[PDB]
Design a protein around this nucleic acid. Structure first.
Ligand SMILES: [Zn+2]
Lengths: 24, 133, 136, 195, 75, 71, 124, 91
RNA sequence: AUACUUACCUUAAGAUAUCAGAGGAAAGUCCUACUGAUCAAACAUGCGCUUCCAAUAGUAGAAGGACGUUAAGCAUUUAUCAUUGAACUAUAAUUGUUCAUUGAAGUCAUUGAUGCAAACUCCUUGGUCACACACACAUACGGCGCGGAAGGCGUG
RNA sequence: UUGGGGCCCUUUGUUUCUUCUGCCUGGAGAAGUUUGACACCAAAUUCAAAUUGGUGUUAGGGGAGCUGGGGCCUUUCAAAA
RNA sequence: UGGUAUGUUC
């Protein structure tokens, strides 16, 4: 296979700190 | 008139004219003779080769004594002054340091300078014929 | 413009000019070592060039291309003037320099993946259009 | 007479028409391409040694090597080095054909785009790309390839594509990382990104 | 249709159209005249030749001009 | 021997430097195997004064012949 | 360096020449080929010239003259024979005369094998 | 002879030639002849006192050439091979 | 691969060492696994031939580079032409000086170019061979270890 | 056959003649050597294999026979004196 | 009695 691959990462499980949409 | 004796010189220059000029460059760089190639060297038989006292060099190809050479100077004192130039720091020709000391026997050209200061030649040639025996 | 996130194409231009014109090849190492710290979008490519270009080192004196002599002896404990059998000593040296590159890659990968994931993934328009265009 | 050392073939009395017809022949052109591919491959992979002039180690050197230790040598097997040198040659080939073309993707809607990036409408190599095409004498290959060619004209104005963002674009592609160092990455991203 | 330069010199002969002949420089004259006959080597003979410094120059009558010198033949 | 390959430059405007200083621009009408060239409506670029209705140039004195048109 | 007394320009293939042209410029490179008109092909030839400013140090009167020489690097050039004025030899070839002989015998073997193969292949 | 044939090898590759007037030209070599007439295309032209311009095509008469610089791979061209054997030419 | 279709071609001549002598098909020609002399090439083979072949008893050095750094080093020198208006000096049509306007070209550079010089760093190259750590030499110097490189000369 | 000492391993694809097995507490094992084998390059059939077209490699040292050349010695023969 | 080139068929 090729020496360059796209990165892959785990989700951080969605509390109120990790929500990018939180406005309150 | 006292000839210095040199050990630990390089033995691969071969030709005497080339060997003398390369040595003499490592002695006194930017000498008159060393920086003009294809000048004749003086042959001074019984014209200083170099100022500050240097009168001749004398090497041989004899397989007993390869690296050793003998520089003879004008007078007895310059022979001792030359050691003074080193000042306990070893001169180096190519990559090897040259140990040097005054010879156990004075040079033949030095004897010619002191004697002028031919019967000697008779004695030396009879010595050579005895050593041919 | 050298610190631009998309400035990898500039550094390709600079490196191909260096590798064609220069005879000495120290300038390529000295440019590529700087490129190794910039958090570019295409940062890995220059890490792969450095890894290949380390991997093709064929003796100890070439390692003075990479950094200085004193830094190798003091920081990484490599002596370039090591006289002896020089094969496995060189393989040990290349293993050590590949480790120090791994830590520097790890730093830059954190920088680049942070900048991409928060910010640069989100910008879609990078160029001026006209005084009548609107932005989202 | 004329003899083509690439093709290894004699021909009859060379006239500029006959010789010029030969040099653009197809069989000749694949053989000539192969020749210089092989010679460039050789002046890369020529594996031949400098002479080694070995000096007698001094005793003062040879004490300090007695201190240090023997250091272990890693050597692969035959089959292992067969596989690994295939892999390394493949990596150098695909790292040589890698080119960075991001800045052409980023400017894909800009007002003067066709005149600078299409590369067929440029003013310096516009005529040359036109001359470069081929005689194109076998059109059966052209009908076999059933795509539309979809050329960008030079006459585009910014009225087309007023609002670029109305579903027309896709996100920028993530930065590629080294596959041997793929466990180096932080495990979880900071924010919860859906999809 | 192409006119080779032999044909143009021969048309200068056949219509007697008066030519200015630029010799190559560092000599520094020009020959005006009319072409009577021309060679394979582009030697030309000139009737009623005038030489001009570089329009008061001297007349020569009829000359043979060696073609190694000639740079332009213009009308 | 062999005629020069100027079949593509016919009937197009062309600038060539005669000797090392003069620069003559005209329409190329014909050529020879010595690279003699005859071009109509010549002009000598310096103001630039026209030569004549029909000129020939001895190709001994031509260096280079770049074409100021389509080809 | 000493060159054989009967060494014509056909012998001096792969030696490093020193070609002198009419405009005072010296071309130095490995000789590859030559021709009837004496126009060479030089492998790594580097052009040198004396600038007009350095030139008056050459005129007849320190001990040794020092001329900074403007050199350009060009590679695999073919010269034109009309311009060449004289050629001198600078350096011997890389390979020794014995080792050059060994290579030539090897190459003759390999070429004869390849044309023998091409013949027997066109027969079948 | 070999040098003129080497110039024929370089067709379609960027060559650089210096004329006898002093000018330098670097461009693709479109056509070359046995007389050394060369036609360069997309040519960058440096005049003797140093001004650089761009020309679309140029035809230089080969008598005026000092030297031509071809690409560097062509030292591996087969016309340089000394020991070489031919396939017995046909009728 | 075959086959078929077209399109483009299908040629400068001549020669193979020289001179002399004997023979064969009065002038010349041709030829002689004929004979002398010269020349040239290859291959063997030699010269007391000539030049060159790097510390480890040490951290070196020699040859050649750098399209390398210090480096904006130190010292000089360069950066348009025409037209018109305005002030201006003046022996002066306004020659000199400054500001603006129209037209024409115009390699980049001024951290450049040119002159001088030095330090430093690094690349390629080599028998880093063997025996020696030695008192030599006027006919000045055993050139009386094995190889290698390059030429000079001689013989077969 | 076993052990000891010295030097070398950058031989960097760990002996580089090829393949296959294999190695640093080691320097090893099997098969092979030119109308042949081996390595690599390019394509398109819609991965690989397949084939066609190409570029290379097949080495270094020592010995026995067989043979070309020189130097020196012996014998024999002929002519220059 | 040929060569190179071209494209079709199998
Ligand atoms: Zn061919």
């Amino acid at each position: 296979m090729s020496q360059f691959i796209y990165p892959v990462q785990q989700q951080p499980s969605l509390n109120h700190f990790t929500d990018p949409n939180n406005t309150t | 008139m006292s000839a210095l004796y040199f050990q630990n010189l390089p033995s691969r220059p071969a030709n005497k004219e080339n060997y003398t000029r390369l040595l003499l460059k490592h002695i006194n760089p930017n000498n008159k003779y060393a920086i003009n190639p294809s000048l004749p060297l003086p042959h001074n038989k019984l014209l200083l080769d170099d100022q500050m006292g240097l009168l001749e060099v004398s090497i041989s190809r004899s397989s007993k004594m390869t690296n050793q050479a003998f520089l003879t100077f004008v007078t007895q004192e310059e022979a001792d002054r030359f050691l003074e130039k080193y000042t306990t720091t070893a001169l180096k020709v190519q990559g090897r340091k040259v140990r040097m000391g005054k010879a156990r026997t004075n040079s033949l050209l030095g004897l010619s300078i002191e004697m002028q200061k031919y019967n000697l030649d008779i004695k030396k040639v009879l010595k050579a014929r005895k050593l041919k025996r | 413009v050298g610190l631009h996130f998309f400035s990898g194409e500039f550094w390709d231009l600079y490196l191909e000019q260096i590798s064609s014109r220069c005879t000495s090849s120290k300038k390529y190492w000295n440019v590529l070592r700087k490129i190794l710290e910039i958090p570019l979008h295409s940062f890995s490519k220059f890490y792969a060039l450095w890894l290949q270009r380390i991997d093709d080192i064929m003796d100890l004196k070439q390692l003075s291309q990479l950094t200085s002599k004193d830094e190798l002896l003091k920081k990484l404990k490599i002596d370039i003037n090591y006289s002896g059998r020089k094969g496995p000593y060189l393989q040990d040296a290349k293993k050590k320099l590949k480790k120090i590159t791994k830590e520097m890659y790890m730093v830059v990968q954190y920088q680049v993946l942070e900048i991409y994931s928060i910010f640069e993934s989100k910008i879609y328009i990078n160029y001026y259009t006209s005084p009548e265009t609107l932005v989202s | 007479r004329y003899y083509c050392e690439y093709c290894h073939s004699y021909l009859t009395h060379d006239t500029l028409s006959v010789r010029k017809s030969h040099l653009v022949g197809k069989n000749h052109l694949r053989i000539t391409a192969d020749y210089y591919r092989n010679k460039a491959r050789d002046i890369i992979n020529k594996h031949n040694h400098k002479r080694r002039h070995i000096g007698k180690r001094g005793r003062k050197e040879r004490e300090n090597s007695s201190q240090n230790e023997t250091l272990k040598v890693t050597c692969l097997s035959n089959k292992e080095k067969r596989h690994i040198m295939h892999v390394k040659k493949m990596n150098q080939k695909e790292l040589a054909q890698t080119s960075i073309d991001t800045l052409k993707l980023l400017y894909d809607g800009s007002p003067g785009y066709s005149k600078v990036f299409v590369d067929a409408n440029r003013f310096d190599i516009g005529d040359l790309v036109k001359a470069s095409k081929l005689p194109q004498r076998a059109n059966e290959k052209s009908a076999h390839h059933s795509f539309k060619q979809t050329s960008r004209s030079r006459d585009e104005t910014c009225e087309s594509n007023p609002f670029p963002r109305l579903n027309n674009p896709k996100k920028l592609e993530p930065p590629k990382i080294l596959s041997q160092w793929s466990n180096t990455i932080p495990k979880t991203s900071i924010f919860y990104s859906v999809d | 249709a192409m006119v080779p330069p032999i044909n143009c010199i021969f048309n200068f002969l056949q219509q007697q159209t008066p030519v200015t002949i630029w010799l190559f420089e560092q000599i520094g004259i020009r020959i005006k005249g009319k072409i009577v006959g021309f060679d394979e080597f582009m030697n030309v003979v000139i009737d009623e030749a005038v030489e001009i410094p570089v329009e008061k120059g001297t007349p020569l009558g009829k000359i043979l001009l060696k073609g190694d010198n000639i740079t332009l033949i213009t009308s | 021997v062999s005629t020069p390959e100027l079949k593509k430059y016919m009937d197009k405007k062309i600038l060539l430097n005669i000797n090392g200083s003069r620069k003559v621009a005209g329409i190329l009408r014909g050529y020879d195997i010595f690279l003699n060239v005859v071009l109509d409506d010549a002009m000598e670029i310096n103001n630039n004064h026209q030569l004549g209705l029909q000129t020939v140039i001895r190709g001994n004195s031509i260096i280079s012949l770049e074409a100021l048109d389509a080809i | 360096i000493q060159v054989a007394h009967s060494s014509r320009l056909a012998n001096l293939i792969d030696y490093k020449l020193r070609v002198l042209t009419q405009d005072g410029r010296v071309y130095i490179g490995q000789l590859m080929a030559f021709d009837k008109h004496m126009n060479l092909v030089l492998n790594e030839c580097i052009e040198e010239r004396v600038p007009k400013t350095q030139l008056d140090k050459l005129r007849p009167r320190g001990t040794t003259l020092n001329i900074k020489v403007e050199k350009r690097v060009l590679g695999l050039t073919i010269l034109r024979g009309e311009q060449i004025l004289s050629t001198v030899v600078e350096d011997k070839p890389l390979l020794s005369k014995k080792e050059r002989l060994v290579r030539d015998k090897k190459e003759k073997k390999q070429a004869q094998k390849q044309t023998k193969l091409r013949k027997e292949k066109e027969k079948k | 002879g070999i040098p003129v044939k080497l110039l024929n090898e370089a067709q379609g590759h960027i060559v650089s030639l210096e004329l006898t007037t002093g000018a330098t030209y670097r461009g693709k070599l479109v056509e070359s002849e046995d007389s050394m007439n060369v036609q360069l295309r997309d040519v960058i032209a440096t005049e003797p006192q140093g001004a650089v311009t761009h020309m679309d095509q140029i035809f230089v008469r080969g008598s005026q050439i000092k030297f031509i610089v071809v690409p560097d791979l062509l030292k591996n061209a087969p016309l340089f091979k000394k020991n070489s054997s031919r396939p017995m030419p046909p009728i």
